[PDB]
Design a protein around this ligand. Structure first.
Ligand SMILES: */C(C)=C(/CCC(=O)O)NCc1c(COP(=O)(O)O)cnc(C)c1O
Ligand SMILES: */C(C)=C(/CCC(=O)O)NCc1c(COP(=O)(O)O)cnc(C)c1O
Ligand code: FES
Lengths: 461, 461
């Protein structure tokens, strides 16, 4: 199910949205609110607002809608009398799972498991996913050192009062421009934007540079080779430095593509080497596919492009997957219960939906579509870049996971603003980048539709 | 709608459950799993397992089911065609709220707002509620000190790389026996059980004693008075100590009743004084009603019993409320967007359900019922304590939020185990305590159903 195209009635946000924003602003700081929606009248790639505007949505709730709005298969799920319980009887999954819990997992997440990762734990969101992955990593690392032996009394005591040796001074290494969530643990590994971090206590963990590729790629092979190597060298030193600071690096976390930090890419070769470095130093290698995961880059998990049989030790996801969680290697399996745990540990209602989404993705060949429609999109982008260098630069992407840079944040914001009133929703990232996150039912005819609209926006800009 | 009583077919876990546990254990450490459920056939106070056992459930998914299983009002919600969208179109609430977002909030959470707290932010679970409350507190404290001065360049820079002054070395003060979640931030303020904390890096934040009362309370008035005062004095010193350590205490977090740490109570006078201490030192006073919130103690929020007009600055909730989040004072309102934020920030599907739950709680007078049924329960407990001092001690509670202690963890575990096979589900907390967390449709005769099963148990034990 899809509308034919955008149809704007008003400027966005419209008056009905601005009234609503007025109201919500009493209860809370509502400034981030773009506009108020009518999800009931949304279908496929089109988001409909409360003022009747129908926009072509290439932002997809910040990349969290897998197969578009009001998908008929999902409707059918909710319509089943047999599914009511799932929607109104939320279990404490850790202790009282439902009967269908493993089957439905087999129908969903387990069917797209990363290579080498037999283990799977579920979480409600992306930040608890990464947090618990951090914990899993720390637990595994003390487990290396302690061996298959008992907990010490000193440890058992100190841990209750936030002290070593119970609470080790271990670290997780992260990259500049990164974003892994905003709870106090994730937040230490996030390095996106000062407003996200400022005033919040943090952890003294190593921060490494992430490759900054110069475009176009054809023209910069050597430079881009050298940049990556420099970064890789900087990671290694960092690990060493911290081993010596006695703040051992237990794990490394990285995004296949840095998203919030400004859609930053690196070579598969880069990631392949980073994976070895991790291994070489006994660092658990944590790949955060929370935003890149879900097929939009042409493969279910972005890391898949790297072509490795042992791509990672832990992989976190959320967003598109409807539920959060993380896959991991058998060897990372917590040694005892009640260590990695929480009340809800996900939500069977999401798994229900997820199982169907995955099915759709497979039956409708959406991974491939993403690749194809992505190419069309990226091609058009390149064409616009040629025609409008004064505005567009560094056109990049994989699958539909595309973006470009504008000269500054004001223009960046203006273009988004214009496009939105013209019937297209784009996202921004970093200071001055515009980003695309189309749902997986984004066909290449929407890629044209966007290109033909935005083309005319540029001639008039 | 509710069954007549328990009917056990098998031991628990039964064979069908043990097979399922076998399977789930391949993918993850499944040891915490009690048994596998059939939520479809579950009904009001009765949880039905996959082996056909029907148990009287006084644990309520660790206190997260407000009005029992398969509640007909909740069924009706899910059956509405108009609600389908809510269940399958999950918004990034921070930026693209649905049209009904404020109305439904008015129908739900805002209608039970704590005194003095105009502000409300939503979260997906209790762990992120507290994390973000911590952040809100840190942000607010910075503002007090920096008055109308803006962000500094030093701060803006250091914050991106996990350093002061950008990242201040502030602290949140917590109590022994506490439990506030397990993400790395919450976890620092948790002091429940070594297995929960061990091997995880933490924060050097002050930890204060939580009063430990002697029973029966009639006979220990002075001692219990003195214990509380000692604790209060210890809090104050701690704050001072840390002000001097230049690890300023920005906030204090406490549970109205410590749950996971072993259902630890204190006087309303105690909490009233603790609230003043906080105020006196410019500490934000954070009350965590994640488990105590939701009416089970006879009032919607446990802190209400304290009778204060300004009970707190921030209050977190989750579990029974279906959604997470925290209320707070206008003055704690983030100064700018994108500081307290995340992708989903809750889930309108939960709010939908919550609004109805609240309505039920009011129409059916469930707060009062809780109080009444609680009394019956607590009375019976006291009677058993008299008859079986060799097993039962320190019977306590408020509303249905009851518990008692057993001589040791083995007996504690045995009694729970026996009761479960006899058709009652109890929870444990601390080393040797048994705890009650009945849903809000638990009535006096359900208390008598339990008291009778458990009397017979204690006799031939
Ligand atoms: C994804 C849409 C976002 C929103 C940006 C923001 O929160 O300001 N970032 C999420 C993110 C996380 C945390 O996930 P969640 O807790 O918001 O669900 C972790 N890892 C990655 C790669 C992210 O994109
Ligand atoms: C409540 C059922 C629990 C489960 C115990 C556990 O996780 O080991 N405690 C939760 C809780 C939190 C954290 O919320 P959530 O992440 O579990 O949803 C925070 N504060 C209190 C008082 C809690 O009880
Ligand atoms: S911190 Fe993940 S749902 Fe709460």
């Amino acid at each position: 199910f899809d509308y034919d195209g955008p149809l704007m009635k008003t400027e966005v946000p419209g008056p009905r949205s601005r009234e609503l924003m007025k109201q919500l602003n009493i209860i809370q700081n509502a400034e981030a609110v773009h506009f108020f929606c009518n999800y009931e009248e949304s279908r496929g790639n089109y988001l409909v607002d409360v003022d009747g505007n129908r926009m072509l949505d290439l932002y997809s709730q910040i990349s969290s809608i897998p197969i578009g709005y009001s998908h008929p298969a999902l409707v059918k799920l909710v319509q089943q009398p047999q599914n009511v319980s799932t929607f109104i009887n939320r279990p404490a999954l850790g202790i009282l799972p439902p009967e269908n819990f493993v089957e439905k997992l087999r129908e969903s997440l387990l069917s797209v498991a990363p290579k080498g990762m037999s283990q799977l734990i579920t979480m409600a969101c992306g930040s608890c996913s990464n947090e618990n992955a951090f914990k899993t990593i720390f637990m595994w690392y003390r487990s290396k050192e302690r061996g298959q032996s008992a907990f010490s009394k000193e440890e058992l005591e100190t841990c209750m009062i936030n002290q070593a040796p119970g609470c080790p001074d271990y670290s997780i290494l992260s990259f500049m421009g990164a974003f892994h969530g905003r709870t106090m643990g994730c937040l230490a590994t996030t390095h996106s934007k000062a407003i996200h971090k400022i005033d919040i206590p943090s952890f003294d963990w190593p921060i490494a540079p992430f490759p900054r590729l110069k475009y176009p790629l054809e023209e910069f092979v050597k430079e881009n080779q050298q940049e990556e190597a420099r970064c890789l060298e900087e990671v290694e030193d960092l690990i060493v430095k911290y081993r010596k600071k006695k703040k051992t690096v237990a794990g490394i976390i990285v995004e296949p593509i840095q998203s919030e930090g400004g859609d930053n890419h690196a070579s598969d070769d880069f990631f392949r080497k980073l994976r070895d470095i991790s291994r070489k130093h006994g660092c658990a290698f944590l790949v955060d596919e929370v935003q890149t995961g879900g097929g939009s880059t042409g493969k279910f998990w972005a890391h898949e492009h790297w072509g490795l049989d042992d791509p990672a030790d832990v992989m976190t996801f959320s967003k598109k997957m409807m539920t959060g969680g993380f896959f991991h290697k058998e060897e990372f399996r917590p040694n005892a219960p009640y260590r990695i745990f929480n009340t809800w540990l996900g939500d069977p209602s999401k798994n229900l939906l997820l199982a169907e989404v995955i099915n759709i993705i497979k039956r409708e060949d959406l991974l491939s579509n993403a690749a194809h429609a992505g190419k069309v999109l990226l091609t058009g982008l390149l064409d616009l870049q040629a025609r409008y260098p004064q505005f567009i630069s560094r056109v990049r992407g994989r699958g539909t996971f595309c973006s470009f840079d504008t000269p500054d944040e004001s223009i960046r914001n203006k273009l988004i603003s214009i496009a939105r009133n013209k019937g297209v929703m784009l996202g921004g990232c970093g200071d001055k980048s515009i980003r695309f996150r189309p749902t997986l039912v984004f066909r290449d005819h929407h890629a044209h539709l966007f290109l033909n609209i935005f083309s005319d926006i540029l001639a008039d800009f």
